[PDB]
Design a binder for this molecule. Structure first.
Ligand code: AMP
Ligand code: AMP
Ligand code: OLA
Ligand code: OLA
Lengths: 72, 530, 530, 72
């Protein structure tokens, strides 16, 4: 209800993209306009805000954001 | 130029027009876009020569190309050198400031740029001042390159000049303040083609490129002449397939449809292709990838061998042609099991024909080849750049002592198998002993609570510089420096102080800076940390 | 080198050791820091030669200096060229990236840097790779330069070499992608000193530099050799005063105490000195400033003349020695009132001895000298740089048609007085007529609701490029484009369409980008706007 | 009371300097660490917030911030 809402916020903050377009379906790449470094730093900021401990080993298989949102 | 017809000059036009084999009906395939035969290719090369002459390209001009892997790049690989101009290959992975620097340094006259790189040109177009014309390349009939070629005749008489005139140039972004420009002549490229063909064509039954193969590059073709492989494939007159932008599914479809047999790529692309879900049901037992980017891992090699792929390694760099060494297996070594074969195929390899390679110390004393003693590789070959363009001090440091210093530390077997340990500038000097960082990085990466490991040095009073480890932890594992220290101590087989673990001082920094080539910037990490 | 003693070479050591006048007891003053005589100066130059030889500086090495105006810079102006090395003057006003580029391009060996520029070196120290030693200059006894000199003998035999060996080099940041390197030989510097001394020493009674003057620079001494004035002052053997960092109160105190008579500065520094509250009660009727930075305004000249200052203008640039022209007044022109004298003293001036200057069109047709026809100035002189260092195309464009193109548009009087209008790249081409931007900028600046005015061009279909005005308004004056248009229409004396005011399209943008030299970046403004 | 308080805020915002040290006495230069461009843009931001219309002709004579604060 509220957790999933704010994951659409984080990845939208650093890349300057609105929350209506940026959703669970919106992946870590393409529509956001993120490179490799931008994607990994978004993955890091996910844990710098929600206090997870991402190993990038789950990030080797998630490419839809939705996977991380639900992972939380 | 005085021709003296009895005096033969080694030129690239001889590679094109005096090949090993020429089949006029053999195809050149641009992925799902165009197909034409070798006769059409030879007509289009002459047309491109006519167009370049029309635009005003002389025998000393520079033409720069910003493109993908396509038939247009293959045409530029021939037409521009035969006219007498230098081909400047632009690395599209560099930052726009570095690209602008290289354009200003090389002093290009015409730029051939793909329409997808136009945003890169948008932010540096004002500060260029050398380029007079821009040619936009497209994947449809709107291409200006196609419009310029279909306005010319297919007849042209290519000149004869000295074999020592410069043919190609590109800029390497190694450990230095600014990109360094390497360059090669016609003779060097022709000799590189001949030498590598003699080395890898005469192999008995493993890893050989012959006249029945189908070649498709998976190397971006603006790096080191795509390892000189387009020249070799044109000389053999084999079917060539160009994929364009590298997408794993497109590449797998091309491998299936075109029956590709020979390729070259880097470990990351190969891992992506093997891990793609589309590749599980696809046949692979005719493919002959050569991995030469950097340090083919043993696990990826083992997986590729289990998928029945003839995968082997090779070594080179921008200054060296590039090819200096290739893994070749004697016919007793194909009877070994998958693990020992994987160990053999991951090595640097033996040096190719006409290459002299030694390992030396800082005093250049030519350490023995015993498989344990490690020093820097220094080489002599017929296809090395003599210096850096418009450079003196770095050029002098490159050819110190009469050999070309590759900046790599390796030990050479008794039978000739080279094993590269790590870079010269990554060395860890503790007191009076010399250790690498890559093996420590791998050992710490074997921990179950690390994603990426970076090991750099930290000066000390008595023991000199000491190693320091920078890693990123794993999920729900807030393992501090003490746990990583204990894990390192849990290992064996190390020298120096006990197990060389007394001043590790391991740390954990969140973000590791990564260069435009995907590698971590160790110098920047040192600047930020110390 | 074969000396051939009958064959005379024009070297800088002859400027030092064969001067017009040599008083061993004449002083060299570093502001409130040190004082010593010309004998001590000649001893310290020989000591610096000894130290440079000890550090390993050969006859082709490069020594870079990052300093203020001091006795150390005067010592470097002599000692480094006499050894045979090139002196690279670093512009400390550039951005650190540009400074790093120039250091990499010139390939310096030793860097002499003041301790206050150390933060600049902090962010570029890693990516240098050419410099082996750094010498830190300080204003106290802790200076490493002083420690290195007081460890050497005051005896040295300076070599004799060709007069065409390069003596100095510096980088100009004009309208181009990267800084351009100009360089000069010993012969060119000696000839520049001789020529300017012959031109401005032989004046009857106004604006002459003679053997009784006291010289103090107010030009940062790393730009164009401080207009060659330290060389001329050393040749005359006059008292020299160096202020260090430019602070108006310190400069005024130095002018009062040292009885300074000859200086050179830029309009901004002169305005600051005249507007300082400390200067209202201070005597000025012995001072002989020459304003040569850019475009001495008539109002500042009038105010300086009302303060009884011999103020006059001069023209030059990095590529030209620099001095090409000086304002000299015939003795009938000193009887004119303050306004006409101010008009005369603000001009570009007449060309100095051994200088040929014409105004040409884009076809190089040598327009007439009538005081109205305007074209680009092209010059020939014994002290012009022959090309840009490590550059071909810009070098070819610099010497087009056998003359050096200064990039300035001017009209020359019938009697020889040059009046510069504006730059070549700032031109406004409407249809088939040619107008400047500076006069429009001044006219719009005469409005009571503008702070700074920028006028640039905007392409159109029929009339070609049309002017556009960018200004910043004043207090409680929300005057839109219509008011500025009406104010421009309120003027007179203009050609083209009626009063050339039909496509002005004046705008108001808040922030105007300003380069590191304090000038507005017109190219960047064009890129942002169009 | 409140007007003078927030002028110490503006010039402290862009230059990242605290409001206790940055006061009326603190000039446009030195202690803030501002160049020519930084100083003129601070002078502009003064009017972009308090809606004055600075001509830079008053800025040619003000070098203490306090002059502008009271000018408002
Ligand atoms: N087969 C290989 N194994 C390990 N390192 C390699 C291999 N091939 C290339 N490299 C590395 O890649 C570098 C090429 O650098 P560059 O000049 O940018 O092309 C070499 O110096 C090697 O250190
Ligand atoms: N007395 C002067 N009046 C007007 N412009 C000047 C004067 N002196 C120098 N300049 C300008 O300053 C420029 C010097 O540019 P630079 O190569 O950076 O030294 C010249 O090209 C002139 O346009
Ligand atoms: C990314 O394209 C890598 C380019 C930078 C590093 C150069 C790689 C080394 C070049 C060649 C490796 C040697 C293998 C040659 C293959 C010849 C056929 C067997
Ligand atoms: C800032 O130092 C200005 C440097 C850049 C532009 C060069 C200025 C032109 C140089 C000299 C002007 C001519 C006056 C020479 C004075 C000779 C004594 C009368």
């Amino acid at each position: 209800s509220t957790i999933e809402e704010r994951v659409k916020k984080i990845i939208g903050e650093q890349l300057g993209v609105k929350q209506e377009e940026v959703t669970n379906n919106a992946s870590f790449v393409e529509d956001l306009g993120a490179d490799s470094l931008d994607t990994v730093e978004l993955v890091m900021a996910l844990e710098e805000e929600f206090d997870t401990e991402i190993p990038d080993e789950e990030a080797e298989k998630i490419t839809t954001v939705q996977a991380a949102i639900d992972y939380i | 130029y005085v021709n003296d017809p009895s005096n033969y000059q080694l030129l690239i036009k001889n590679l094109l027009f005096s090949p090993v084999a020429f089949n006029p009906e053999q195809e050149i395939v641009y992925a799902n876009h165009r197909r034409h035969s070798y006769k059409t290719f030879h007509d289009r090369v002459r047309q491109f020569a006519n167009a370049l002459t029309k635009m005003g390209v002389k025998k000393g001009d520079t033409v720069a190309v910003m493109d993908y892997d396509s038939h247009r790049y293959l045409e530029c690989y021939f037409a521009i050198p035969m006219i007498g101009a230098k081909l400047h290959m632009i690395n599209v992975r560099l930052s726009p400031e570095q690209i602008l620097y290289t354009i200003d340094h090389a002093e290009d006259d015409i730029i051939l740029i793909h329409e997808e790189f136009l945003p890169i040109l948008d932010q540096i177009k004002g500060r260029i001042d050398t380029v007079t014309r821009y040619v936009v390349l497209r994947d449809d009939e709107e291409c200006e390159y196609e419009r310029l070629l279909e306005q010319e005749s297919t007849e042209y008489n290519f000149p004869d000049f000295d074999e020592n005139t410069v043919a190609t140039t590109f800029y390497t972004t190694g450990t230095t303040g600014f990109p360094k420009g390497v360059f090669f002549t016609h003779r060097q490229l022709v000799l590189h083609t001949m030498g590598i063909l003699s080395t890898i064509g005469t192999n008995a039954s493993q890893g050989r490129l012959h006249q029945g193969d189908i070649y498709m590059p998976i190397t971006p073709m603006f790096h080191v002449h795509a390892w000189g492989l387009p020249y070799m494939a044109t000389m053999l007159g084999v079917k060539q397939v160009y994929p364009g932008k590298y997408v794993p599914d497109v590449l797998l479809n091309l491998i299936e449809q075109e029956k590709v047999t020979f390729s070259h790529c880097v470990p990351t692309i190969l891992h992506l292709l093997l891990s793609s879900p589309k590749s599980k049901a696809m046949d692979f037992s005719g493919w002959k990838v050569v991995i030469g980017g950097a340090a083919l891992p043993k696990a990826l090699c083992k997986s590729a061998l289990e998928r029945d792929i003839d995968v082997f390694a090779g070594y080179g760099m921008s200054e060296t042609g590039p090819i200096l060494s290739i893994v070749q297996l004697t016919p007793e070594q194909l009877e070994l099991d998958v693990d020992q074969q994987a160990e053999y195929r991951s090595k640097t390899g033996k040096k190719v024909a006409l290459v002299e390679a030694y390992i030396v110390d800082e005093d250049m004393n030519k350490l023995p080849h015993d498989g344990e003693t490690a020093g820097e590789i220094v080489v002599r070959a017929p296809w090395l750049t003599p210096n850096y363009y418009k450079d003196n001090k770095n050029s002098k440091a490159l050819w110190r002592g009469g050999y070309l210093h590759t900046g790599d530390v390796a030990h050479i077997d008794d039978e000739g198998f080279i094993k590269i340990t790590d870079r010269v500038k990554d060395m860890i000097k503790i007191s009076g002993e010399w250790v690498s960082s890559l093996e420590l990085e791998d050992i710490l990466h074997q921990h179950q609570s690390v994603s990426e490991v970076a090991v750099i040095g930290m000066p000390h009073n008595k023991w000199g510089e000491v190693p320091l480890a920078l890693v990123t932890l794993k999920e729900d594992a807030q393992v501090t420096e003490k746990e990583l220290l204990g894990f390192a101590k849990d290992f064996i087989n190390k020298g120096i102080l006990a197990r060389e673990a007394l001043l590790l001082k391991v740390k954990i920094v969140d973000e590791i800076a990564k260069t435009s080539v995907g590698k971590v910037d160790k110098k920047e990490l040192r600047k930020l940390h110390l």
